Design an enzyme around this catalytic site. Structure first.
Site, PDB file in Angstrom:
ATOM      1  N   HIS A  15       0.743  -4.533   8.965  1.00 23.31           N
ATOM      2  CA  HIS A  15       1.625  -3.735   8.141  1.00 23.31           C
ATOM      3  C   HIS A  15       1.570  -2.232   8.523  1.00 23.31           C
ATOM      4  O   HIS A  15       2.620  -1.626   8.752  1.00 23.31           O
ATOM      5  CB  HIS A  15       1.243  -3.915   6.688  1.00 23.31           C
ATOM      6  CG  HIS A  15       2.238  -3.350   5.722  1.00 23.31           C
ATOM      7  ND1 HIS A  15       3.509  -3.863   5.567  1.00 23.31           N
ATOM      8  CD2 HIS A  15       2.150  -2.296   4.878  1.00 23.31           C
ATOM      9  CE1 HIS A  15       4.156  -3.158   4.646  1.00 23.31           C
ATOM     10  NE2 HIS A  15       3.342  -2.219   4.195  1.00 23.31           N
ATOM     11  N   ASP A  72       2.552  -8.857  10.202  1.00 22.69           N
ATOM     12  CA  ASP A  72       2.315  -8.104   8.955  1.00 22.69           C
ATOM     13  C   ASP A  72       1.527  -9.001   8.002  1.00 22.69           C
ATOM     14  O   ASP A  72       1.966 -10.124   7.632  1.00 22.69           O
ATOM     15  CB  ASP A  72       3.636  -7.706   8.339  1.00 22.69           C
ATOM     16  CG  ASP A  72       3.531  -6.841   7.144  1.00 22.69           C
ATOM     17  OD1 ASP A  72       2.618  -6.970   6.272  1.00 22.69           O
ATOM     18  OD2 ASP A  72       4.441  -5.989   7.001  1.00 22.69           O
ATOM     19  N   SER A  81       7.771   0.233   4.412  1.00 24.69           N
ATOM     20  CA  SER A  81       7.152  -0.211   3.141  1.00 24.69           C
ATOM     21  C   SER A  81       7.999   0.412   1.996  1.00 24.69           C
ATOM     22  O   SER A  81       9.225   0.364   1.995  1.00 24.69           O
ATOM     23  CB  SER A  81       5.587   0.116   3.115  1.00 24.69           C
ATOM     24  OG  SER A  81       4.941   0.512   1.860  1.00 24.69           O
TER      25      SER A  81
END
Ligand SMILES: [Cl-]
EC number: 3.5.1.9
Lengths: 261, 252
Positions: free
Chosen positions: A243, A211, A110
């Site tokens: 995610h 995700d 991320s």
């Protein structure tokens, strides 16, 4: 005796929050350094996010050739771009010096992948202009062997086109506008190209088909740019969960372990 | 006689006590170039052999007849027949397929074999099914996957596609958008790891073929790995030490 970094005072940048998942010992050859994500803002994402993954790697690493650490950084809204990154850079710099890490493999998820991407773009500034943080970035480029970018954010501009709703967090990390993000792929790729060749850095891009928070768009926009500038890279796409499952996923652990070689 | 050219099969690394994996190579050549032969992969294979200190790998390289004398899918069927016989004769339990140019095309065509039901499969197709049952990994180097896209991008490549597809490229049965559902079935039913490789220095094929394949893979959420690099001109890719390293490190 102890229960592993040398704590400092004051510790503005959160170096003392560094975790060690696998310490250096006689046979250690490579270092893995993790950077957690969480949208610049989520206090539930910590350096311990990678505990499971690091421990799976530690199991596979039957000869103890890997050492593994995870760094902390301050969060928005109080600390905003690029100051969260500079905390991670500062902390990694101190860790390298303290442990004598001669080389490193950076793993980020991320926004942690965002930070690694920002580091790879450091040559955008010449040595005459580089700030102290930028000089530390240059310092890390000199010792990085590989990066593993897991479900990363690379283009803030494209993120807001795709996800207007994500303004809720980006306005906190980019309080003067996302146009202040200096590392849009289409602007900095020539410098990333120089860095990967100059420093022989191998780039691994990973994304999960499951995700729910990021589609493949960020990944594909990066790939398109990487292709246009003819940068070498490797990509791995699989069903690696949601995610926040990706950085816990046993297939990701395997991928990283198998590619440190 | 040896119609399908089985006797032209090369052995680069024979079976040993320790052998756990087989690598089978398929040379390319746009269906027609007689200068591509099974020796195309000698350099690569010998590098891998050297990397393989514990002799866990055996390696072989196959032959097939060329166009215009024979046309699609008969060149593929030669390759299939030859691999089937080799698998039987050597007792190969699993296999890793490595193809370059149309050799990668062939592997792709094998991956799409479930497009026909068991009730309808020809003997060659049944052989393809038997390969799918024992394939562990594929490595597709600078391949051709879509004939339609190939002539869109290069109308001038009719000079060789007209030899392999004399009744027209519409007879190509494995356009990705057409067969991806069946490839999806295969890869999951059988646990096949797909690796796609292309060179930025490939003068014969841009990235279009690769990108068209990726887009389709992503649309069906098929797992794969991609490796892009400067690996030389088209007919140098299969001799590049970085390719050799990529393959060896990924047989694990
Ligand atoms: Cl038949």
């Amino acid at each position: 005796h102890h229960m592993t970094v040398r704590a400092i005072s004051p510790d503005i940048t959160l170096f003392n929050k560094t975790l060690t998942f696998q310490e250096i010992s006689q046979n250690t050859r490579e270092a893995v350094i993790y950077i957690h994500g969480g949208a610049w803002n989520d206090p539930e994402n910590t350096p311990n996010d990678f505990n499971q993954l690091a421990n799976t790697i530690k199991s596979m690493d039957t000869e103890s050739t890997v050492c593994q650490y995870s760094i902390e950084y301050r969060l928005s809204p109080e600390i905003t771009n690029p100051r969260n990154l500079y905390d991670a850079v500062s902390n990694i710099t101190r860790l390298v010096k303290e442990k004598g890490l001669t080389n490193i493999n950076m793993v980020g998820h991320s926004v942690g992948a965002t930070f690694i991407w920002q580091i790879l773009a450091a040559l955008k500034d010449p040595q005459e202009k580089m700030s102290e943080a930028q000089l530390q970035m240059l310092g890390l480029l000199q010792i990085v062997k590989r990066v593993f970018l897991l479900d990363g954010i690379y283009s803030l501009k494209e993120l807001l086109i795709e996800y207007p709703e994500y303004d809720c967090f980006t306005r906190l990390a980019f309080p003067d506008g996302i146009q202040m993000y200096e590392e849009e792929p289409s602007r900095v790729m020539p410098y990333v190209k120089k860095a990967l060749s100059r420093f022989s850095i191998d780039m691994h891009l990973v994304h999960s088909y499951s995700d729910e928070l990021l589609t493949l768009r960020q990944t594909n926009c990066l790939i398109s740019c990487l292709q246009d500038y003819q940068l070498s890279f490797k990509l791995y796409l699989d069903d690696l969960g949601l995610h926040n499952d990706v950085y816990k996923n046993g297939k990701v652990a395997k991928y990283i372990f198998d590619n440190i070689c």
